[PDB]
Amino acid sequence: LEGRTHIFKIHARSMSVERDIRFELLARLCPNSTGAEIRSVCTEAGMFAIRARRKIATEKDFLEAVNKVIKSYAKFSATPRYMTYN
Amino acid sequence: ERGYSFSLTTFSPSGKLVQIEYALAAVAGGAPSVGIKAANGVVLATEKKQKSILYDERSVHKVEPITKHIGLVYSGMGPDYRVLVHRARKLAQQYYLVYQEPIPTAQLVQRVASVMQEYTQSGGVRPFGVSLLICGWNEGRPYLFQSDPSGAYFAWKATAMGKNYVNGKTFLEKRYNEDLELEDAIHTAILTLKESFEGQMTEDNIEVGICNEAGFRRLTPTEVKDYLAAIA
Amino acid sequence: TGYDLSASTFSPDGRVFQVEYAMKAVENSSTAIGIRCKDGVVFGVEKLVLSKLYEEGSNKRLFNVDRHVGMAVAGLLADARSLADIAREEASNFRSNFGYNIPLKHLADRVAMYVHAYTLYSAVRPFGCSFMLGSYSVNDGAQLYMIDPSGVSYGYWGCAIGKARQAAKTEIEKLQMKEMTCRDIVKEVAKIIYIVHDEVKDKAFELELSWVGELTNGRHEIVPKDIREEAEKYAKESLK
Amino acid sequence: SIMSYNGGAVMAMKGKNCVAIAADRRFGIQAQMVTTDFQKIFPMGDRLYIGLAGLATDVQTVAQRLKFRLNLYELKEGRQIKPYTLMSMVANLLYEKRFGPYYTEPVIAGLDPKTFKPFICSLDLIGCPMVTDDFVVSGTCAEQMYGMCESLWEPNMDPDHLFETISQAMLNAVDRDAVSGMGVIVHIIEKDKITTRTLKARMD
Amino acid sequence: SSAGFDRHITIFSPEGRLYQVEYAFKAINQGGLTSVAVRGKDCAVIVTQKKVPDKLLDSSTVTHLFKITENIGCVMTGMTADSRSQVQRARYEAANWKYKYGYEIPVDMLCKRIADISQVYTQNAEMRPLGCCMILIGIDEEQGPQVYKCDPAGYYCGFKATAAGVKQTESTSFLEKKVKKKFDWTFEQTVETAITCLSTVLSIDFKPSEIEVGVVTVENPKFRILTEAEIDAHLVALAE
Amino acid sequence: SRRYDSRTTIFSPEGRLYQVEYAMEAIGHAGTCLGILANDGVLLAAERRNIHKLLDEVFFSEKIYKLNEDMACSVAGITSDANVLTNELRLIAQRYLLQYQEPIPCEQLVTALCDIKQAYTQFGGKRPFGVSLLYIGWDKHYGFQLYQSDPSGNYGGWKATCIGNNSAAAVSMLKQDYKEGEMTLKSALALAIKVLNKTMDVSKLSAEKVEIATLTRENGKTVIRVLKQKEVEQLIKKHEEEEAKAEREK
Amino acid sequence: SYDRAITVFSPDGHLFQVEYAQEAVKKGSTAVGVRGRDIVVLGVEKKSVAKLQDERTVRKICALDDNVCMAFAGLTADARIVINRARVECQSHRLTVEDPVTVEYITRYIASLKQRYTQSNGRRPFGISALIVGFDFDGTPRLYQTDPSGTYHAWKANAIGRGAKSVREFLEKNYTDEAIETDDLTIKLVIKALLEVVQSGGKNIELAVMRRDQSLKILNPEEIEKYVAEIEKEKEENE
Amino acid sequence: NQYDNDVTVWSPQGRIHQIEYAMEAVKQGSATVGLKSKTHAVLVALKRAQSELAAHQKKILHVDNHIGISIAGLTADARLLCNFMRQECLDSRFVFDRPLPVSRLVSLIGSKTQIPTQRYGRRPYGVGLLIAGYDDMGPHIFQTCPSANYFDCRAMSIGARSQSARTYLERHMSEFMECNLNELVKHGLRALRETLPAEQDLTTKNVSIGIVGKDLEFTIYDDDDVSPFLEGLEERPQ
Amino acid sequence: MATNRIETLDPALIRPGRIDRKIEFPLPDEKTKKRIFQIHTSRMTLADDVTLD
Amino acid sequence: YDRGVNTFSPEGRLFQVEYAIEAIKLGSTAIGIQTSEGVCLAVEKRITSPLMEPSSIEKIVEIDAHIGCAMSGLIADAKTLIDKARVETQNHWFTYNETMTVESVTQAVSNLALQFGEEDSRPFGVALLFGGVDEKGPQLFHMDPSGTFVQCDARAIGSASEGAQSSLQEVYHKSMTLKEAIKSSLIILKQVMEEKLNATNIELATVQPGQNFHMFTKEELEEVIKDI
């Protein structure tokens, strides 16, 4: 749980965001996720900010990023058959 | 018996029943046979080679009656052959219980084909590796019915099954006609059996049964030895 | 690979690897031997103390199936109990139907068929047991049988089941059977079990001896082992 | 008895080259009639009928069961059914209820499907076949119809004398009977055609 | 040519074969044993040696000749558990024949029923196919003696001079070189040829204590197992 | 005992069912039927898969199975599975007649067979029925009908049908020659002759290799006309003369 | 029988076949449905017909009672089975309690069947998603949807089938209370939503309504044509 | 590890690993200790909790007027064998109108747990029974295992880090046989004070004791009638 | 990278950090088909007696 | 690589039950608090769409007239167990004229929390919070898929249970009151939820020895929320 909060602090410390948002709610929606998926969430939230012309993220950008990465590409997701170490 | 009940028979990616194609190949690797319908009777003939000179020819029988007027041979594996023979035996007697009348050969082939098809669907079991040649003289016109492992069946004027069935079939297309007698049927049958067998064909290497409208009759090695004078 | 999995499959050279692996499962158990005399059968089981681990009287491998038949099991233990319960049930059916004591051949054949029937399929595993069966009757004499994990059941004068198997039968074959009463054979098996299976990996061990024959008047019971204490007074004289 | 619950009489008579089957029309509850158009003779294919007599429940039940098995047989085999085959089928269907018996006495009358050979037979309530050459009867008024057919039958009969003989037999044997009356239907069939006539019976 | 699972269960391969039964045909070969049957004029002879390496092992319970019924004997090869289970199936169905049909079962029908049972172990792919070989002998009215064999594949057959086990390519070669040459068949032509064909295949020339001889004759239609004395008589009877 | 299990029921992770489509691609080979309902009657067409010279033709039937008095069905797929289906279907319709003493309407017959097929698609791992098959028939409520069974259990009424993979172009041809109810029984037969002439690549359509059966409406008979070969021959001659008349436009 | 468990949990906490059998719903035809306050309306889009054949057998909207109505998505055969069992259940409820069958009961039955169907030994889960619209006692219009998981779940307008995200986004910017004021406007609202969905040629637009004191009326596709025509007229009046 | 999937598969070393895995499932319970005198049998367990606010998962449960069991591992299989235990007790209590001796009951437990350890598609029961009882011939302290190889002992201890408990029991097994209830029970919980790290022990919050006596019915105690038993102790060494 | 099927891939390539965008290409509609037929007939002497619909 | 579903682990646990304990975590949160005045309870609905009619989502369902409940994660596996638990409580009051206590209810449920198998299928996927007022005062009870049933004084479950348990142990003690615990729960709720806390998000369920039945209609929730 707290690992993903800290990895959000890692990928978020040097990027243009709105610091008034939280990060714990973002971590609570990523139960089985890797740091790579976290990185994709951060970058894709930035890419949704590039759809408009802004200089700061919104919470809704990160929610778009979560439902863009996790729930959509969770059909591939790389770890339902490596957690069993096949 | 355990709770599995799952069919091991699966279609291919293309759509093909690989275990039935393999069962047809296992039929094709068996002993050859030929059977000919010729206006008054039907002749069946097999090719029964002992492996050594030690074996006896009075124990195992290829030509086998199902009722008093219905003969039946195969081209495949005897161990499955006897099982489905026994099934056909038990099945014909229920018809004769119900209707008090000897079963027609088409009705036999319907029910046996239903059994074999229903068994290849059934779970955890392999198909039979047996192709039949069923015949009989029901209601004047005699018949001849070939089945296969896939459950299907046909109706032939003359056919063959086993090794070199293609060569025997190309001999049958040229040789047979519409009208013959039983003796000429035996003549062309031993000719096409002599097409593929070894050189020494005696009263025991072949085994021949006929059908009359007066009933089924299974010929003896006596008349088989009588026949191969001026052979084929 | 692939051919060691099921108990139904054969090998490219024609044997069942499940049955072999189950045979060498019993190979790690303790050495338990048996031998008959001209009027009885004597059993004996090496039981090992580690330090405490129990009380002088648990899990005794010398079972007692019928009034005149008992087991001398070795191998996986719970499977041996289930097999003993099946054997008690079978002797019960025989006593209930035909009205007399079970002959040891029929008992061994029924048990062998059950063990063999558990080897035929993929739903069940083969047994991990190998056990002994002794008896005595006034019209039958002494009979000693032996059932492997596969189900091969035939008769012996002497046998051995466990780790030390040849080295326990090296001196079974130096005894004889016609000239012995079983009261010598008690201390003979006792002194040899104390001889075999040295102190090296296990430190303390403990002896059990079952005992059937004419001297028990057809009964089967454990020896009064504390009475006459016949092992140890010769076993400590067996070290030189 | 249970056979005398609803009355009933079925007569079949073999002629020279043809066969005639007749039955009564009355339906009712032991002394109370209900209708005059109750069907007891059923068509089973062409030129082959069956008659059913006794308790009406088993009449309609066995008729529908037999029609079930009959259509299954004629669809499993493209030919139409021989009469001995039908007799054996009715015998097996009745004998399946050996201890749960139907109360009926089926009468089969039909021609040969290959030749013009006639055929008659009757069965009992457990499945006992009986082939004869002259006539079979079934129902309450047995002895009346026995007296008529053993009195009036000739071996070689043109269909007109066949019709008049079975007419007089049914009329007189029914008029002596009490619980069975109220009209007669007569089926006179042959190789070429099928004729159905109704007689002027006493409506009492 | 193998596809999928066709090396583990009984299915069809691309070459068309099934591999379980053609592994079962050398499941016989781990027995290390040889069997020879002979049928002559009005007798029939079984011969089979025994392999007892142990002095502690008995001699009575090593018997392979199993008297199935009062006119039917048999011998077994292959693994022992399959053999004995096959024997109890044979005994049970012969007794069922005697109950249902009244008269004594002919040796043909017994082989047919056993072959069909073996087919049921073969036909379904979720039971192991019993890797043992079965030899039958018997007397029939109006036909004299018979000798039949039942295989694990389920093909019964039966013939004049019959042999299966370990070394029987050579045994059937010698029996082609011996029964095709017009020999007559006495009680001692059959017995002498039975002991000597195995005595030339194995080349041992041994004691009367290794082979077992089961005979049946139309003077005594009971199945009969010979004693060491008359075995010794035949053995010195072939000593020119 | 589970590593041998073939899993012919669990969805595939592409998104569809797996074994179902391969049963469909098993439908696609060995078979080519259609019928033309466009008033007073309905017909069926069929191709001989075993047109070899050494058969008997003694069955007085072929691909058609007169399953009742007023319904038949054309088969395509593996034959003997369909025999299992025709036996069960015939018995279903006959038990309905046993239950009501009124003939069986064609859609509850179709849905009964569709529930049987879906019953083996849904649960167990059993092999699905690789048979699609047609339906012609009559009722009290709509007249002449046509239905298309599928191995999934899905069905669907048509006015011009199709099973086999050779006959998708036939559906294209049926649309390009679509009529609004014009089956004088010579127009529809000539159209069917034209379709089977074009779609099968058998040059000039030998009449032994084809099969046509019709179903007309009679008051007390409801005859099913499994017609003989001579009218097929003169139908082929009629159509080849009309193709010669049609190519005078070039 | 078939002693096996088809649907196993995932290593990360899923049911593969429940979440994955939603994809079969996701690749089926689209169907919307709203409730007005007095007239209920629903209909399916994308019949994707051959335009030249029968259409009385491909009807995707049926009824279980004279009070309740259907719709579904996914594959049609599982819908056929579930509808047969639902008809049996609603009529058996009428056997007992003498009311007309409440819609909430039949949705609980369908979802309960679906869940005990996914739970059981080796039964493949139902890849459908139904819509159950009815107006029980005292005229209250309600509408529920199903799911392969088996969660009856009351909505106010529909979003299933192909591209349901787009359709719900149009219903999102079209949640006007004004739209459910005029029954005709509610019908036109379904037509406009389905027009903001697929081709909507006025051919695959199969719609059926119920005015809650009658039975279901399937509309003849000339009235729907005039509905689309007046929708296009209002769209021209927007400029 | 293609032999490590099922119960049916023998290993090529003969060790069927489903039983070993069930053993390791027993090893992950709480610590517990059972030990007998000549006249009294005492089993003592240790409770644990999921969090601070929640209560502690109880271990000692009742079976019969003279039989009580300890437990370690899973709780569903625990209650399953528990229900079977009460049922088999009250069956003979019904039929023979006598109390059951413990040894035949534990033989029935082994015969019960054999079948899910041999067929295919059943698990071995993860269970950690320590059984104390009274037949006519005095106290018995049995333990089970998922391999159904039940033992009779004089003192066992199963659960997490239970081996130090066995070391304490060895250097006092001579002293155990003579003493009365009080110092016996406090020897059992001195086994428990060495099954723990040296700074949190048994402050009336985690221990339970079940005594059966020749006149005493089997009775469980928890923290409050254990507060009399917890005094009479000294500290741990340096 | 471009594939036909994706389910037969080893998912270790398909994790993010390697590949971030996964894009579906469906069979489009019956509207952009008009653009496809239009552009693939944009450079030809189309006889106007045909309809692309 | 598909093994048998009734396989333990190399480490010891199982597999499928552990995967069920993982499958809890995606569900919505819930918070129940035992107080001697009575048991209070709270939950989040997780409203997704405005088309989604809000009063139809059930989280607190009713077992008895005095035994409450709340579910999590999968809804419908919970619905089966709720129905059956009701049936067995009705059997107890019938054959005993008395109230089946909450511990006996949960023993009856976790008797078949794991009867999953191929003969005589999967493990269930729901965490449950059980309350009510028996003779032993108020009771709050928590089970799991593994049947490992324990009493909890104030347990928080599901997706936000880490900070819920932590910040709950911050505020909780033994002598709390009712309304203080209610607002103490919903403060934690609107720290752990994602949407704005309003009239439609959450729902309460309180059962008391005085307030005899669990009764909680709408718009006293409004009065409770405007008290923040």
Numbering used by the authors:
A (entry chain A): 348 to 433
B (entry chain H): 3 to 234
C (entry chain M), E (entry chain G): 5 to 244
D (entry chain P): 2 to 205
F (entry chain I): 2 to 251
G (entry chain J): 2 to 240
H (entry chain L): 4 to 241
I (entry chain B): 329 to 381
Pull verbatim passages from the article behind this deposition.
A set of ubiquitylation pathways conjugate ubiquitin moieties on target proteins, which are then recognized and degraded by the 2.5-MDa 26S proteasome holoenzyme. The proteasome is composed of a 28-subunit barrel-shaped core particle (CP) and two 19-subunit regulatory particles (RP)5–8 capped at both sides of the CP. Substrate entry into this chamber for degradation is controlled by the axial channel in the center of a heptameric α-ring, also called the CP gate, positioned on each side of the CP. The globular domains of a substrate are mechanically unfolded by a heterohexameric ring-like subcomplex in the base consisting of six distinct subunits, Rpt1−6, which belong to the ATPases-associated-with-diverse-cellular-activities (AAA) family.
